[PDB]
Structure formats: C-alpha cells, structure tokens
Design a protein around this nucleic acid. Structure first.
Lengths: 183, 836, 183
DNA sequence: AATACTTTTATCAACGCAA
RNA sequence: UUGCGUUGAUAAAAGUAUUGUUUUUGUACUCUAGAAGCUACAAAGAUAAGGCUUCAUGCCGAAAUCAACACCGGUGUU
C-alpha cells in the first residue's frame, strides 16, 4: 500500500459512486471535513502524503471492504511494473478490471459457493441508505457472527427497470447474465 | 396460615398477603402490563393478506414472460416500448395482425387488470357498466372513454349530452376472457406459431384464482396457513380441522346436523319430552319413526294430527312441545332425509347408516362444485358414485342452501350411538340418561386449560398474569388458606379443580366490588392496598418488559423530497414535500389558507409558474374555489386560449428532514425517503480513561434478514458503524442492554443519593447519550417535579430527557421478579446479543 | 483497519521479531527516521494518529503482507467487540491466535494446495536476512509471475537447531507437525 | 395505504321448551 | 350445568377488485428546436428495510409468549 494522488482520485471516484450528496461522506466521524477544506482537497489543493494516517485510513475503509484493501496493494504492484498500463488509463479503471477478473475466477472455480445481497451504507447523520451496493461473498470463508473473510462490493449500472432477484439461484443467474453492467 | 388476595383489573393486577391471626401485612405489590387491544392483529392480518395480492400480481407477469419465452415468440425483453397505447392495440388486433411486440403489450395490459368474479349501490353501478358488454368488449369501452373524455382510469363523474353521471373501470372477468379469446383466434389466423396449448396456458394464467377453502401454498411449498401442511399431510378443506370436538369425548369430531344419527336423536329426544295423559311406549315410537321416514310430505301439523289419532283422544291435550316466536308447535322431523329421498339416480333406502353420515359430512362442509367433486374420492370407497350421481347431488346441495347450511351438532356419532338404543325403551331425556350412565404440570397450575376458556382478549391476559402471581406466591410462601380474587366463574372452577385433584383444601372464592366500595366507605399504590382489603375480608412494582424484535420498522408511505431554501436558509437544504388534495373541499380551502397566510412561497407553483399564480390570486380576492367551480368549471391553468389543464391539487414544501430510510430508485434525481422510524433498545458502555458512561441506540430498522441463511441479526461491522456515530470509543467495556420498561438505577458517587426510573427510548439524535425516563411509582411524570442533584428538573411538558454522560453518576440495572423482589446487577455478559 | 495506540505496539513487536538491529528498520527510504525521532516514537512522545499517511502505511507495508492487513481489520473487529479478549491480553497475542486459527482452517479443508517458501527481508545496509520468516500460500489464488493473493508469514521458535526441509510434501508435513510452536 | 365484494369455523349474550 | 330453536355482537383464518403515494418515459400547457419539471393525462417499475428453494394456481416478513444464571416436569441465590 502506498498513499499518493492516485489514491485521491480513487477515493473521489468511489465517493461519487456510493453517495448521491457529498455532505454524507466528508462529514462522517473519523473523516470530518469542513466545506472549505473539502473544496480545497477536491480541487487539488492539499497534499495527501502529509495528511493524518487515521483520517486517510478512515476514508479508505468506508468505501472499500476489508478484502478490497488487499487488491489495492496488488493492483499497485502490477501497475507500477508495466509501461503498457501506465500511459493508457488511470488507476481506478485498472482497479475495476482487477476486481472483475477476481470475480470471474470465483465464478469459474467455486460457482456453488458464491452468495450475495444488498448492502446498506451509513451516512453522516446516521440514517442509512438501503441498497447502496451489491455485496458478493464466498460462503466457505465464513468467519462468525455474520462476517465474511472474502468479500467484494459492486454497483449495478443498468438501464432496464427490473431489480435484482432474491434466492441463491436467481441472484447468481442475474450476476452471470449481467456481467457488464456492474462496476 | 396465610391469605392471598388478588385484584384482577384491565391493565394491572394487585396482590396482597395476610396471616389471618395477628393480621400483619406480609407482602403487597402490583403487576403492570399493557392491555391487549384487538386493533394490532387486525393491522398485522390486513398487511399479511394484502402483500399476497401484490405477490400474485407480480407472479402473473412473471408467468406471462415465461410463456412468451418458451413458445419462441420473443427472445429478449429489453426493447419493449413503454409509451404505446394498449387499448388501441387491443381494438386494432381484433381484426388485424400484430407483429409479436404489440401482442405482448396487449396481453400484458390484459393480465394487469382482470375483473370481478363474484357475480356467478356499487352493484347498481356495475349494472350500468355491464349493459354495454352485450355488443362491445371492455377494450372498446375504455378506448371510446379515452378518446371522448380524455380520462380512462379511476372513478369519475362527467356530464354527457343528457345528464351528469358516473364512470367506473370495473368489468366482469367473463368479458376479458371473451375479448382475449377473440384476439388470440384472429392472431392465430395470422401468426401460425400460436398453438392451442399457448392460448389455453394464457387463458389459465388470466382467469386463475385459488378458492377460499384452499389457502396459500403448493405441493412443495408447505405453508401452515392453508392446506399442504408442514407435517406431510394434505387436507381437502382447511376449515375441516376447525370443527369443534364432542362435549363428552374430547378427541372426536362433531356430527353433521343433517346426518341420519342426528335427526334420529333429535326426534327421539323431542317426543320423550312430551307428556300425554304417561309417556309413549316403544312400539308407537317405532311406528312414528317409520311413519316420518316413509312419507313424501311431512310437517309439524300432520305430526300432531297423527299422534292425536294414534292415541285417539284429541290434539289440544298434549303439553311439552317446543313453542316458536309466534306461538305454534315446533318439532323435529326427518327434513333432510325426506329431502334426500328426492334423488332419482341414487337410492338411499337400502344404503348404509354410516354412509348417510359421510354424505352429510361432505354436503355440510363443501359448498362448491370442485369441493364436493373432490371430497367424494378420498373419504368414500373407490367407485360407488357415478358422474351423473355426483352432478345431481351437486345441484341438490346448491338448490338447498338453507337446509345444509345449518351447522354442526353438539355431540358426536360415537356418543349418539350409545344413547339411541337407550331412549327407545326408557322414556327419558338426554340428561337423565347421561347422569345415570356417567360419561363426563404436576405441582403447579398450567395456563393452557384456563386461557382456553377465555375469549375476550382483554380478560385472558389479566387471567394469565394472575395465574403467574399465584404460582409465584405458592412457590415463595408455602401454601395458603384463602385465595380471594376479583370469565369469573371459570377461574373459580379451575382453581377448585386444581386444588381438589391435589388432595389439599384451600378456600378459593370471588367477591363483588360493591362490597369493597362499601368497605372503603365504612372503614374511612391504588391496586395494592385495595388487594390487601380484599385479602382482609377473606411498595414494590413489577413491570412487563417489551423485547420483541420484529415490529413495525417505519411507515409504508413513500415520500418525495426537494432541495430548496425556505425562509432563512444560507444554503440549499433538503425538504419533505406535502400535498393538498381536492382543493375544492372545505378542508382543502382551510388548509390552503393555513399554508398561504404564514408563507406564500412554500408552494411549488409560486416558484416555477408564477403567471398562473396570478390566476389563482383573483378567486381568493374577488369572488371560494367551489363557487368558481359551479360557475365556470374548474380553475384552469394560464394559456393564450382556454385549453390549459385543470387544477385539483397543490404540492408544497412541508418540513425539514429528520429520521428516515433512503429508498431512492436507481435512475432517480431527488432523494426519496421513508419516515417515522422507531427505537428498540439501548446498550450501555463505560471507559475507565475518562470515567463516564456512553449509550448506544438501536432501532427496529437496523436489523435485517441476512444474505445466505435468512437469520435475523445485525453484523459486527454495521454495529461498529453505529458505535462510531454515537460517540462510543473502541476500548470501552460493555455493561448491559435496556429494553422498554426496564428499571434503571442512577446513583450519585459524591453525595450518595439513589433514584431509579423506567427506560423508554433514546431521544434527540443530535446530542449524545440522551435518554428518556419514565417514573417508577406512577404512570405520568407530570409537572415540574425535581430529581436528584446531578440530573436536574423534569421539563415543562412532562418529559424527562437527560444526558447521562455526566461526571459523577453510576448506573445499575434492576431485575424484578413477578412479586417485585428487586435484584440489582451491574454486568450482564461479555458481548451484547446480536443474533436471533 | 483503524490506526490507534495498539498498532504501534504491534509494529514494534514485529520489528523486534524480524530485524536483528533497529538501525536496519528506521533508515529505509519510505520510513526515514532519525535517531532522536526514533527514540521519541519508541518511547511514546509522538502520536501515531497524526503522523503522515505514507510513512505509517510504509511501516505497515514493510512489516506485513497484503493479505494480512485484511486479517488485521477482521481481528480488530472481533477483538474490540468482546470483553475478555480486550481485558485479558494485548492485541498482538489475539492477532497471532487469529493467524493460527486461519492457518489450521486452511490445512483442514484443502491441504493439497498449501505450499511454502523462504523469506528475504531487505534492510538499510545493502544486505538483508536470508531466512527470517517462512511463507505459506495457496496455489489456487496465484496472480502473476511470482505473486500470490492469499499468503502469510510465520517465524520458527523451535529450539532444535534444524533448518527448513525444502520441497512441498516435507515442508507441509513439518508445518503440520510443528503446529504448536510457531507464532 | 384504503375503499368495494365473497366464504368458513368458534365463543358469548338474550328470549322460549325438557331437567 | 346438559340438549334443542330463533336474533345480535365479537374473534380467528382464507380468496379477489379498484384506487392512493412515489420514480422514469411520452403527449398537452408555459418561456425562449432548446429549457423549465409547476398543472393534467396515459403507460412501465416499486409499495413496511429485506430473504428462501421446490421453478411455480410458489413461500416468509407489523400479533401473542418474558426476570436471569447455576445444578439433575422439579430443586438453589445476587
């Protein structure tokens, strides 16, 4: 894990994904910006390499799961060792590609083990957002009291007004047919 | 030598104990519980069988999609146009060719609205709206309504060339089947891929309906609300397990009133209660039974004439008969046996006796064609009933609704077969024969027998709480000599049967409240000392805790929000909208003046269309909306020529946004919320670093059914999110949890003062560690009453909301038993319970 | 994962485990301490919550693997939510218990893909340590040329003075035999 | 959420007839 | 207290219809082919947050039960 400006663009992109109003994100406990400091941080003003470690590691944890903070280090490892990837695209597009490849390996090797559900995210006033993302886990890596060790977090970008079905078979089949509308 | 006295009220039960010699007061307390109002299971049952309609509507659409996909007509379902007119496509495709996508929109709009089916002031309007179906399909009716009046759906009045009347979009579901059959026959003549199995499967999708005696479920779904039970069985009629049991054999089902045995018993008991100047013998009884059996037309008059000629004296000498409303002679005949002799295809004369009892069980329970046609297969012998016989008894039971819709006898066939040989010879009633024949927890008293015989829902809860108080008292203070109490006779008989079968005599008695009011007038916390008065004729509190987890999480009403600046805002804030419905109504005009006087710019119309707000400002000034309605019609919008739309409603910025659930859709533009979210419990934490308590707060909405197994829990990461919000540090330690009506002790550490309250909730979610407290001794906490030195005063309204993150307090949890003996704890467990 | 007072102690304990001198640790180019500030950090003079993000994450990235920061997050959840776990041990003891639990759960289910190897941790002297930790990884979660997705490092506390047997089957038998000693 | 329609089973009350 | 016959209330459970609230899209109205998203109408999606397997006349989700812990329906104590 390294902290640089690519992590700032990744934080800004995923904040733009899960939160419709920005006031819900930067006023969370642990992050706790003001409006002037947010308009300074968002507009390239203040450095991220010199910020507090607790504030950066609280911004990284609300948007990524505890397993998705492992694929950021491996994405940074394979991204700073290839001239064919640095010039073409930014870091978050490669991160989305990495996450989708690991999902494809999950669906190939361990297809009768993949479970999922709707996730809810807590905003800056405590009132949560029902169905903020779609969480996808491996049931063999269950841990205890409803927490999983291998877990991912997607979001659907679909045009048809038809929600994701419930049950293990219908949800797995929806994920298999719509493997392009999730980022 | 102790005396127990109980005061059994609506929402409280008082209890006291005396010693009967010295008269000292041993114990006195009061149990307080909520009253079991019957309005809550009505809301739960209404929403339970109101979600099934939405579920089956959606499943009709799913089955239609699978039908189109399986027959090869449409492959993918993404590019179907939302913005066509379905009614024009229905009326057009009666005689033309629709190219596999217009047919989909037509048939889907058909199955989204099918009609009423019970017809095989409201009925007068369906009578008016059904005469035009003699030559037109409902699609034609709705299309002419659409292109004549503009408006199609709802119920709406309109003025035609003749007279003002009413229009309603309800048509019977026979016309929808006829229209769909014509459409699919024409499209089968055009499209050769519509098979006859396709139109049959679609027509079973459209007009399919379960029956009222079938209930929910499937062969493999196995719900316990209809048939197909979870025990592996399968009923025929889900009301066939609700039939009550016999009076003297509590494992036998009752007998049908129109059986052979019930009518034989009723006639043999009807004329043994008849005294003739001295009772009728066995031979004349067998003769009159054979005379009422083999007779085409019997009655209550010809029976009295026949007994008058059989004993040869007269008719008016006889006394003992059952009189009627208007004074006559009423006596049982074999009415269902003489009526069942009018069947030309099946002969009942040489038919068995038990077969005449199963034929009245089937014809008494089942009322439809499919019920009787299905309940003649499993119960009876295989065969034994031809199809013409089955149809003739189906139209027989449909023709006689008053005879077979009477009900069920209060005895059984197994018992009534033990008296019919007896009341032939010995001329007696049923009661003397049953008297001369005699048919009729190990330490504590169980509640299953006594709540069984209470049916008022307010009384049964009080009865169970009094039973629990009695069980706790005889566990604590040995045994008594008197149990005096205060629907009423059955607990007397239950306690008497309990102590009588246990070979220990205690005087259990009731007393009237007028006597005790007389005692209070004569002799000179409200339930306690009055229960002591009850036990004298011969404190501590115990509340009931509310700890049920799945309750109403929020409203079901969907609200719309907008981002605006109303009044004195510096930046854009989110605002919950409202709506004035039916402006012409008197309450709509009072509400319009209520919004209009305090703020003019709260309306959305004033900010986006101001020109037409200079057409609503004149009828409120120089004319109020109902007068303009009857004068010129509705208050139309602003245009150059008078073709603007009408005005019936006005939506406005109602309020600011507080507690909610954000249920905004995928492709939305504004935030869409659910309001009115309620709290459940609170967890109490403590840290030795600062030395002050922290208090979480959970809601009903924070838990969910989880994603792999379906269990109801809250995970640890979401719990840590709620911990981060509410100000609880991560190295604090967990003390206990508090539900509703739990007793909470607050003790000061500098000057050692103690109070204890009841927990209510965790109000004001802007400050931290604020908690609402209810009083210990009373039920209102009214006034500006003072408290201990660290908390402060009760507020002006009567609501104690205190921030318990103080610097000197200390907090304990009190667990009172049913008698009120308080046990004070300080540390419940290692980890709060999250999995249920 | 959070950054608080119980992360500095884990960093200091793992630095004492892997490096033979402290001067090899705090002069690496991501960390870059001086001898006054290192004793100020080692004695409790500074706050780890307000330190620079790149330096703290560089320390945590040098000492730990990319997969074990996920385990740090999960162990922090289970550790702070329980009372006896909080008040009976330090955090690094429960972290080693969590690591051993996951290792035995790895061997119990599918032991045919568990492989191991030697570890070479670089220092600030140009040289390094040739064998300080033992790597154990899963063959199914292989990423690229030499990268593994799921991987952990252990240390040998045996007092028999015997070297590591190289090869798959013998090392698997040795780590299964010595399951009660390594931490 | 909130009005229209259909059906079954059970339990109390109140009056009359045997006890 | 047991049986029978009428008329009144309550309770529990089941099967349907039409709307109401809200989101998007289309036409009309308004301002200059664009915008505005107010006022109408018509479609399509949702309707306590959510979840399941049996793949379908599919199913569950707003009631009641309540002092805890320890020792073999009973026994002990803050």
């Amino acid at each position: 894990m390294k902290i640089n400006d690519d992590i700032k663009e990744l934080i800004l992109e995923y904040m733009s994904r899960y939160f419709k109003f920005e006031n819900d994100f930067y006023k969370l406990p642990g992050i706790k910006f003001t409006d002037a400091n947010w308009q300074k941080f968002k507009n390239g003003g203040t450095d991220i390499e010199k910020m507090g470690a607790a504030r950066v590691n609280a911004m990284l944890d609300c948007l990524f799961d505890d397993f998705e903070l492992a694929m950021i280090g491996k994405a940074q490892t394979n991204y700073y060792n290839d001239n064919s990837l640095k010039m073409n695209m930014p870091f978050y597009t490669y991160y989305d590609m990495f996450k989708k490849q690991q999902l494809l390996k999950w669906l190939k090797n361990n297809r009768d083990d993949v479970i999922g559900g709707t996730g809810r995210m807590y905003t800056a006033s405590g009132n949560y957002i029902a169905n903020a993302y779609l969480e996808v886990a491996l049931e063999s890596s269950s841990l205890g009291s409803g927490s999983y060790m291998l877990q991912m977090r997607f979001k659907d970008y679909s045009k048809g007004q038809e929600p994701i079905p419930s049950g293990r078979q219908n949800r797995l089949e929806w994920i298999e047919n719509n493997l392009e509308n999730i980022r | 030598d102790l005396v127990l006295g109980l005061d059994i009220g609506i929402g409280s039960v008082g209890v006291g104990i005396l010693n009967k010699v010295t008269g000292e007061i041993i114990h006195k307390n009061s149990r307080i519980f909520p009253a079991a109002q019957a309005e809550n299971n009505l809301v739960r049952r209404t929403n339970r069988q109101g979600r099934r309609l939405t579920r089956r509507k959606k499943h009709r659409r799913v089955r239609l999609n699978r039908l189109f996909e399986e027959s090869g007509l449409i492959t993918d379902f993404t590019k179907i146009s939302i913005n066509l007119n379905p009614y024009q496509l229905r009326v057009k495709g009666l005689t033309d060719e629709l190219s596999n996508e217009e047919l989909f929109i037509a048939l889907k709009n058909m199955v989204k609205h099918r009609g009423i089916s019970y017809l095989d002031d409201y009925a007068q309007i369906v009578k008016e709206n059904s005469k035009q179906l003699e030559t037109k399909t409902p699609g034609q009716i709705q299309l002419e309504r659409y292109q004549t009046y503009g408006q199609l759906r709802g119920d709406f009045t309109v003025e035609k060339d003749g007279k003002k009347h009413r229009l309603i979009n309800v048509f019977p579901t026979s016309a929808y089947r006829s229209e769909a059959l014509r459409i699919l026959q024409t499209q089968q003549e055009f499209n050769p891929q519509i098979t006859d199995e396709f139109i049959n499967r679609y027509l079973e999708i459209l007009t399919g309906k379960r029956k009222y005696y079938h209930g929910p479920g499937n062969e493999k779904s196995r719900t316990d609300y209809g048939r197909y039970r979870t025990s592996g069985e399968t009923l025929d009629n889900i009301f066939g397990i609700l039939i009550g049991k016999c009076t003297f054999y509590p494992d036998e089902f009752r007998a049908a009133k129109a059986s052979y045995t019930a009518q034989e018993f009723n006639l043999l008991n009807d004329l043994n209660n008849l005294t003739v100047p001295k009772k009728l013998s066995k031979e004349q009884k067998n003769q009159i039974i054979n005379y009422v059996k083999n007779e085409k037309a019997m009655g209550p008059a010809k029976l009295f004439k026949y007994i008058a000629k059989l004993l040869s004296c007269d008719v008016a000498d006889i006394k003992g008969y059952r009189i009627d409303k208007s004074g006559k002679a009423e006596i049982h005949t074999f009415e269902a046996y003489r009526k069942m002799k009018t069947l030309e295809t099946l002969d009942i004369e040489q038919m068995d006796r038990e077969t005449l009892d199963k034929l009245a069980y089937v014809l008494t329970l089942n009322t439809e064609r499919e019920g009787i046609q299905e309940a003649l297969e499993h119960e009876f012998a295989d065969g034994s009933f031809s199809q013409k016989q089955v149809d003739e008894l189906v139209q027989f039971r449909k023709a006689n609704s008053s005879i077979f819709g009477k009900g069920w006898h209060n005895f059984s066939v197994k018992l009534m077969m033990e008296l019919i040989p007896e009341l032939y010879e010995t001329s007696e009633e049923q009661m003397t024969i049953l008297t001369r024949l005699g048919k009729q927890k190990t330490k504590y008293i169980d509640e299953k027998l006594l709540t069984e015989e209470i049916y008022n829902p307010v009384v049964a809860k009080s009865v169970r709480q009094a039973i629990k108080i009695v069980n706790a008292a005889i566990k604590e203070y040995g045994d008594f000599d008197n149990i005096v109490i205060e629907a009423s006779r059955v607990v007397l008989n239950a306690l008497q049967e309990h102590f009588r079968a246990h070979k220990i005599d205690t005087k259990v008695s009731v007393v009237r409240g007028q006597f005790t009011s007389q005692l209070r007038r004569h002799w000179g916390h409200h339930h306690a000392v009055d229960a002591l008065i009850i036990a004298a004729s011969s404190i501590l509190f115990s509340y009931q805790v509310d700890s049920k987890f799945n309750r109403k999480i929020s409203d079901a009403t969907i609200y719309a929000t907008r981002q605006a600046k109303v009044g004195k805002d510096k930046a854009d804030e989110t605002y919950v909208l409202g709506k004035i419905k039916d402006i012409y109504t008197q309450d709509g005009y009072d509400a319009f003046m209520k919004i209009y006087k305090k703020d003019k710019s709260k309306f959305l119309m004033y900010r986006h269309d101001p020109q037409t707000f200079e057409k609503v400002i004149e009828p409120i000034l120089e004319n109020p909306f109902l007068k303009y309605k009857e004068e010129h019609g509705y208050i139309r919008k602003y245009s150059k020529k008078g073709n603007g739309p009408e005005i019936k409603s006005l939506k406005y910025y109602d309020s600011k946004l507080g507690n909610h659930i954000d249920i905004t859709p995928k492709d939305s533009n504004n935030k869409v919320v659910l309001q009115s979210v309620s709290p459940w419990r609170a967890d109490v934490y403590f840290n030795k670093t600062t030395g002050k308590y922290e208090i979480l707060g959970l809601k009903y909405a924070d838990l969910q059914f989880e994603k792999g197994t379906g269990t109801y829990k809250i995970s640890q990461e979401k719990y840590n999110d709620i911990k981060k919000k509410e100000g609880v540090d991560s190295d604090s330690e967990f003390k206990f949890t508090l539900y509703k009506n739990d007793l909470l002790l607050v003790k000061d550490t500098e000057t050692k003062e103690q109070q204890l309250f009841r927990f209510l909730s965790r109000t004001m979610p802007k400050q931290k560690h604020y908690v609402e407290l209810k009083p210990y001794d009373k039920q209102k906490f009214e006034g500006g009453e003072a408290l201990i030195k660290v908390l402060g005063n009760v507020a002006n309204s009567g609501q104690c909301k205190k921030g318990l993150g103080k610097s000197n307090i200390s907090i304990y949890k009190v667990r009172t038993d049913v008698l009120g003996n308080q046990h004070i704890i300080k540390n419940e467990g290692d980890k709060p319970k999250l999995d249920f």
